[PDB]
Structure formats: C-alpha cells, structure tokens
C-alpha cells in the first residue's frame, strides 16, 4: 500500500529470497516450509486480486517481460494465484482484442493490429508464461468468444489483407516470411469467424489478382489451397481448385489455338485472348451492356468459332470488359506503352478515330454503365490529366465531361501501368458480393435442418442453433433461424410441437 505493484512484487521476490538463507545458514529446514508458507500468506496470501487485476494488466501493457515472468513465478508458486492470473489476464485478452474490431470508424487498420495483439499474447505465453498451456487454453477460448460477436467485419478485412499479402513486389523475395505470416494468417484467423464471406471474397480476390497484375507466388496460392482446404469442409475448397483447373484448361486452349495459327503465320499486331471458365468453381459473371469496336465483334465471332469445338455442349455468354490489356499509346514527345483495363481500353480505342468526344456519346458509344464509367474516369482523370482530360476537376464529378485527347505526355518509364480500377473495387460491389452469400445460406440451412429432422424428430431451437454452429463455417443469425423455420414450414418439413416453438416434428 506504499510502493507500486511492480515495486512490491520485486520486494516480495527479494524478501522471499531472504527467507531461504535464514534457514540455509542457521534456521531449520523443517520450519523453512512453514516459514515460506506463512510469509507467502503475509505478502501474497489474501492479496490475489488488488495485485492481480490492475498490476497484472498494467505491467502487461507496459510489457516488462522481467516482472511479468517474476509475477508468473510469484503467482505460480502460490496457493491458487495462477487462477486469478488466468481469469484477469484472459479478460485482459478479451478486452484488448475487443479494442480492435468493434470500432467502425477504424476499419482502414484492423488486420495489422489483430496480428499485433496475437503476437503480443503469444510472446507473453512463450516467455512471460514460460510455455504453460493453461494460458493457451484461455487465449483460444477468449479469442473465439470475442470473434463470434463480429463475423463480417473481420473476414472481409482479413480477405483484403490476405490479397494484399498476395501481391508481387520488389520489396519481398522471401516468401518464407510470407509462408510464416501465412501460417499466422491461418492460425490467427481460425479465431476469426464467418469464413464463407472470406471464402467467396477470396474467389473475388483470385479473380482480381489473376485478371490484373500478378500474384505473390505460385507456391503461395498452392499452399493456400492446401491450407484453406483444412479447417473447412472438403467441398469448401472444390471451387478454388476448380479455378486453377479452369485456368489450366484455358492455357491448353491457348496452346491449341497458337498451334492452329502456327501454320497461318500471324504477323499482325491485333491480338485476341479469352481465358474461358465454368460457372461452378468461379465467381459468377453476367454480361453488362457495353459497346465494342466492330473488329472486336469480329474477334467475338472468331471466339465463337474456336469456342464451339472441344467438348461441344458449349454456348456463348461472353465477357469483354473484365480483363486488362497492354497497349502502345501515341502522344507527342515519345511513344510509351500502357497496361490498362478494358473499361479504359474502350475509351482509348475511341481516342484513335478522333479527338474531341464528349460524355454523351462517351456514355453511349461505350455503353458503359454509370457506376463503372465514373470510376473509369476516376483513373487518369479526376487528377493527373495528361492522357484524358475531364472538365470537372477534383473528387466531385459532374455529367459534363468534355474531352480532347492530349498530345503531351511525360513520364520516365516505359510500360506505363496506370491501372487502379480492376485491382480496386467499389463499395456496392463489395456489398453485392456479400449479398450473394447472404441469401445463399438459405439452401445450406434448409439442407441442414431437413437432415436434422430426418435424423431427430424433436429438437428445441437452442439445440438447433448448436447443431448448426457445429456444422457450418459461418455463424447463423437469429433472424436467419426464423427465416429457415418459416420457409421449412412453407415447404412442409416442420410442425410446431406442443403448439409452441419449444419443440418441433418432421411431419409435413
């Protein structure tokens, strides 16, 4: 009640260490153990909360690994002080994890902080708790109890950060670290719940990663398929391996077509490339109304011709906007090459035939929807206008864009890769990619509950929730439980047993 909690802890440490040698020289061994028992009651006995809540969490936040190990000793010797240690420090885990994801204004940085708290608690176990396992039990319990509460802020932020770690830079060439931080991804986000939204978003992420730019490594994606195969269903990693098999099918079609133009001897500059896919293992894509230069339409018909062979049973529903393409660009003061997107490639295709178009037939002769075309003009316009030049300036954009293509263009590099768009995405794009999972759980829980009542006739709702939580990779809301109860009654697999929702039957 005079010194600080760490000061009193060091005093207790040294004063207990005093009482040994008193016996060692002169006092009695058989009263050494009564002496330490009494003294430890006098110092540490009956003070296992006012030392062990604040002065625990205070010196954990200060993270003095010496005194944390000191109190670990000083409360692993004592009568039961490690129980107070486990409870106070585990509540400390829950709250000091909870100081991340419940913050809706602070979603720009969540994943790195989660990694940080994971790292800190791991280090406090491995030295400050000296690889005891009770602490690990409280850790995992506390983490899962925490993240059952917010499922679909983290898994989406986590998916974006997983994709961010799946980028090809010049800074990283040791994928061993990215293997190790990938191991931390798997282990740490096994605490994070709602993995179906992460799963579908990772379909979106491999789409946005292959379709523009290039991935961090081949073995990185292979290791992720093998790792995410674990901890989820074995029919939950059928689509991803289907992605890479469909990519190999498209490459084999590429080899076949290149061999079939080996005797036609292409020397022309105009290229067509379609990597074709099936809708069972990929993100779904529906064509949107867009306008294509008629030679591209000729290439579409060529694509039909080479499409109709090789496992016929095939019928066109083409996409002609989702790729990125390399293009040479005429300007004054040099001819450099652009790596750009099809939304912008059509823009640049019209800025060959003339300079002087306006947003009316830029809206029309592209055909591009408003949501895509605004963000198309947020790249290389709404700033840095030396290729396209848009009459509204700044973040605010009005419907009056007047364009005259610029002769002037300056940069110090070749292969001018100015392409945010397809390695970016919009808010309602994310929201819609979430709703394609929201009322997609419907058939999942439908199948699960029809199988349950086909297995056990009576099951209260507080047990249906637990069987579903056992079975599924995401947490099911109480609203969705009412939703499936009512729809099962609509399709005659439930009857309310005893005229209340307490129990049910499988009678129609």
């Amino acid at each position: 009640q005079e010194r600080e909690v760490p000061e009193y802890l060091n005093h207790v440490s040294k004063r207990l260490e005093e009482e040994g040698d008193r016996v060692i020289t002169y006092l009695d061994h058989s009263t050494q153990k009564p002496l330490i028992a009494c003294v430890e009651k006098q110092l540490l006995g009956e003070h296992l909360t006012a030392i062990l809540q604040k002065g625990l969490d205070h010196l954990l936040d200060e993270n003095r690994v010496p005194d944390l190990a000191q109190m670990y000793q000083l409360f692993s010797r004592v009568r039961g002080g490690q129980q107070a240690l486990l409870q106070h420090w585990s509540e400390y885990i829950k709250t000091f994890g909870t100081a991340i994801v419940i913050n809706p204004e602070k979603d720009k940085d969540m994943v790195q902080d989660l990694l940080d708290f994971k790292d800190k608690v791991d280090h406090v176990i491995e030295v400050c708790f000296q690889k005891n396992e009770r602490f690990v039990n409280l850790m995992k319990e506390s983490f899962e109890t925490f993240i059952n509460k917010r499922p679909n802020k983290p898994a989406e932020l986590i998916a974006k950060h997983v994709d961010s770690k799946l980028r090809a830079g010049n800074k990283e060439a040791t994928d061993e670290e990215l293997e190790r931080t990938l191991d931390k991804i798997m282990i740490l986000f096994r605490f994070i719940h709602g993995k179906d939204v992460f799963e579908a978003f990772y379909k979106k992420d491999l789409a946005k990663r292959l379709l523009v730019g290039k991935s961090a490594s081949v073995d990185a994606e292979k290791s992720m398929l093998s790792k995410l195969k674990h901890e989820c269903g074995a029919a939950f990693t059928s689509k991803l391996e289907g992605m890479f098999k469909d990519m190999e099918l498209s490459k084999d079609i590429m080899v076949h077509f290149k061999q079939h133009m080996q005797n036609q001897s292409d020397s022309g500059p105009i290229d067509l490339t379609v990597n074709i896919l099936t809708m069972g293992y990929w993100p779904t894509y529906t064509p949107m109304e867009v306008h294509l230069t008629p030679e591209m339409i000729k290439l579409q018909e060529v694509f039909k011709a080479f499409y109709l062979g090789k496992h016929s049973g095939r019928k066109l529903q083409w996409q002609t906007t989702l790729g990125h393409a390399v293009l040479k660009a005429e300007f004054k003061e040099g001819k450099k090459e652009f790596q750009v997107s099809l939304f912008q490639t059509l823009v640049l295709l019209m800025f060959n035939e003339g300079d002087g178009f306006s947003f009316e037939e830029i809206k029309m002769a592209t055909g591009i929807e408003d949501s895509e075309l605004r963000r198309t003009l947020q790249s290389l316009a709404c700033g840095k206008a030396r290729v396209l030049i848009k009459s509204p300036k700044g973040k605010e954009v009005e419907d009056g864009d007047k364009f005259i293509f610029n002769g002037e263009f300056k940069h110090k590099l070749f292969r001018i890769k100015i392409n945010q768009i397809q390695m970016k995405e919009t808010v309602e794009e994310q929201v819609s990619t979430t709703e394609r999972v929201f009322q997609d759980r419907q058939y999942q829980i439908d199948a699960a509950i029809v199988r349950i009542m086909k297995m056990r006739k009576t099951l209260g709702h507080n047990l249906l929730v637990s069987e579903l939580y056992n079975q599924l990779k995401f947490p099911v809301k109480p609203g969705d439980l009412k939703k499936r109860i009512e729809s099962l009654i609509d399709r005659d697999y439930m009857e309310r047993d005893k005229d209340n929702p307490n129990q049910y039957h499988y009678v129609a």
């Binding site: 789409a207 290229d271 896919l277 002609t320 005429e330 300079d355």
Partner: peptide, 21 residues
Amino acid sequence: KKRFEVKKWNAVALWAWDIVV
C-alpha cells in the same frame, strides 16, 4: 496507324451451360 495501335486485347469469360435443367 492510330493514336493507339492495337497490340493486345485479352479477356476473361465463362463458358456456359447447354443442357436442360
């Protein structure tokens, strides 16, 4: 020949079903 001379068009797309449900 043009203000962008066409060197590469590349696309990703889906091959679709053709059997009755």
